[PDB]
Write a protein that binds this ligand. Structure first.
Ligand SMILES: CCCCCCCCOc1ccc[n+](CC(P(=O)(O)O)P(=O)(O)O)c1
Ligand SMILES: CCCCCCCCOc1ccc[n+](CC(P(=O)(O)O)P(=O)(O)O)c1
Ligand SMILES: [Mg+2]
Ligand SMILES: [Mg+2]
Ligand SMILES: [Mg+2]
Ligand SMILES: [Mg+2]
Ligand SMILES: [Mg+2]
Ligand SMILES: [Mg+2]
Lengths: 358, 359
């Protein structure tokens, strides 16, 4: 059922935005059609975990007239599309930054035959413009509007800061200087767990975990009823683990199941696998990694992969996952004490995360 | 005087932004330094025409206490001025990438800096926009005008992004515009019309360059409704169109040494004022020569397009266009003057920075 109201609201949103462009922005039906295709290609096709979480948190909190339920759940649906549109935006631009080929078993937006890279960049930011435009339209008379926008913008900013951490992680930050060219790091001295945890906290955790929970609480008018200290701890922990999962799958999960080809090795990313391998590797193994990392050459890539399985990384992953589950279980119970319906929805979100195959 | 106060506020904004990153966002000193340099390079060094207009509008409406209002209003105007300046910074970073440009204000484009990767350039460009919101939320947190300011600022930003879509798809036959299918640059240029030019330009330039600074100056001085907005918008659209026509003409005919940027319109096959004006008046023979030479990087092909423009007396058309604009502007400024004398004067001042600019 939630998927049904969600997809009805997508149409509501799509119609408001495309008709506004027709009527107030002088747009021709040729471009309206292009934008319609763009929206559908970029915003649909996923599992909508972020947006569906907003709905579930809302449905979990309606208690702590059936008109209110209808209004609150519609508000949640709009909020859910705001995060789905935001991630739509993030992924269009990220695929460009990461030189990716496919996404959900289709070409990346910028990789479509009639999308130029310069138009893809612009399309990507229109997606983010729509997130604000939809909020202002659907929530114009809602008192939570200001708080919602403020929190949403902070999270977006947080994510762009994390993207900076990601995209500059393979350059020696002491040598960071607009005026001087610098090659990829050769010593990898910054590929540390502490540095990994920072990239992933900022670029993933806030928008993937905190934001949906927070938006769910806002449309419920229930925010100040939860322990926000514990909520953020939980969001940071699940968010980190989610990105470790993403990083592991990038290397080890068949692209046909993932829907996308991995680029982290080629792009010389500070992944979970890279940091954890380098922390434990022999000098000999580090030498071979350095000789093979961050190149498109397919044997070099397979070398890195071999090194990873040689150093029992999957063993380290299982142990990390159990340590995470342990901490997540504890925090949910701390949450259960004063917010049992909210704690229930966090458990459901955790259930969508723990040991996902995707 | 305005530049003095304006630059003090720049320091104030920079400090807030970069300290917040260090204190709240776990940012290391190396990246705080990169971001400071990125901010200075992208935001400083221009004419600050947009930002200085906000201050001027506000210092003009400071007619309609102990001196406290004035200090507050002028500071707010300075912050809004930097909001547009940062927004313009954001547009130029991303536009130079999109336009395959090489220099900007006589230095390399941001994405052309030796130690800036294109992927970082894209993100750096976006941080600049994020900063416009963050500076507004901090400095204006207790102002009643906050929501209105943010609503209008955002509407203008979105307008500008729509204009950029118009600009970037102008060389493609829109009937064949299709994500799934590759298409070359147009060969008939049937959409290179003045009607299509006027829309590209209204959206990508006039709203953020002309309307927005005027509106923000009115907001911080709390004078927004005191003004005929139909006339004001008319003015901004006319002035903004002219400015872009000027930008387009300079792209072709002003030495990069005075421009501070190397022109890319011919090479990028842009629906420029020159191209649409030429195509409307040109003989069949001239048109066929243009078609053979437009949208190519080859230095011989671009020189042909310059020659065809000279041959067709486009400098003659421009002078008459400019004269026609100047007349309508003066008429509209007088309509404003009746009930809005202070604001009309600031609009006259903005016109003065625009008309026959040597930029
Ligand atoms: C102009 C746009 C500015 C950039 C905005 C921030 C982009 C944040 O993009 C993100 C954040 C988290 C995950 N992802 C996608 C992930 P993937 O789906 O594996 O490509 P990854 O980190 O591994 O690349 C993209
Ligand atoms: C990721 C955000 C990118 C899209 C945001 C909209 C960009 C609009 O940029 C604009 C709008 C108007 C003039 N300019 C610069 C002009 P120039 O300074 O001559 O390069 P032109 O139109 O000829 O390129 C840039
Ligand atoms: Mg990616
Ligand atoms: Mg990435
Ligand atoms: Mg990945
Ligand atoms: Mg451009
Ligand atoms: Mg340009
Ligand atoms: Mg130009």
């Amino acid at each position: 059922m939630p998927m049904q109201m969600f997809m009805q609201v997508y149409d509501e949103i799509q119609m408001f935005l495309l008709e506004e462009l027709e009527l107030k922005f002088d747009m021709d039906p040729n471009r309206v059609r292009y934008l319609r295709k763009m929206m559908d290609t970029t915003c649909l096709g996923g599992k909508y975990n972020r947006g569906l979480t907003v709905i579930d948190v809302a449905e979990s909190l309606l208690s702590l007239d059936g008109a209110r339920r209808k209004r609150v759940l519609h508000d949640a649906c709009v909020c859910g599309w705001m995060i789905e549109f935001l991630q739509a935006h993030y992924l269009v631009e990220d695929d460009i930054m990461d030189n990716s080929v496919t996404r959900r078993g289709k070409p990346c937006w910028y990789r479509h035959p009639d999308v130029t890279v310069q138009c893809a960049i612009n399309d990507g930011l229109l997606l983010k413009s729509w997130t604000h435009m939809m909020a202002m339209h659907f929530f114009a008379d809602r008192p939570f509007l200001q708080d919602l926008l403020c929190r949403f913008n902070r999270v977006d900013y947080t994510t762009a800061v994390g993207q900076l951490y990601d995209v500059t992680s393979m350059f020696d930050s002491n040598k960071l200087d607009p005026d001087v060219s610098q090659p990829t790091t050769t010593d990898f001295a910054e590929f540390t767990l502490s540095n990994y945890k920072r990239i992933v906290k900022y670029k993933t955790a806030y928008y993937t975990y905190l934001l949906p929970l927070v938006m769910g609480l806002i449309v419920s008018e229930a925010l100040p009823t939860v322990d926000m200290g514990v909520t953020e701890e939980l969001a940071m922990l699940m968010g980190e683990y989610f990105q470790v999962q993403d990083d592991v799958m990038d290397c080890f999960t068949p692209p046909e199941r993932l829907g996308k080809v991995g680029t982290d090795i080629q792009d010389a990313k500070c992944s979970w696998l890279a940091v954890t391998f380098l922390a434990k590797a022999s000098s000999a193994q580090v030498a071979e990694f350095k000789a093979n990392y961050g190149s498109g050459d397919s044997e070099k890539v397979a070398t890195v992969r071999r090194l990873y399985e040689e150093a029992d990384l999957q063993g380290d992953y299982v142990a990390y996952e159990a340590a995470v589950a342990e901490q997540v279980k504890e925090l949910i119970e701390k949450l259960r004490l004063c917010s049992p319906g909210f704690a229930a929805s966090v458990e459901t979100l955790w259930g969508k995360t723990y040991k996902r195959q995707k």
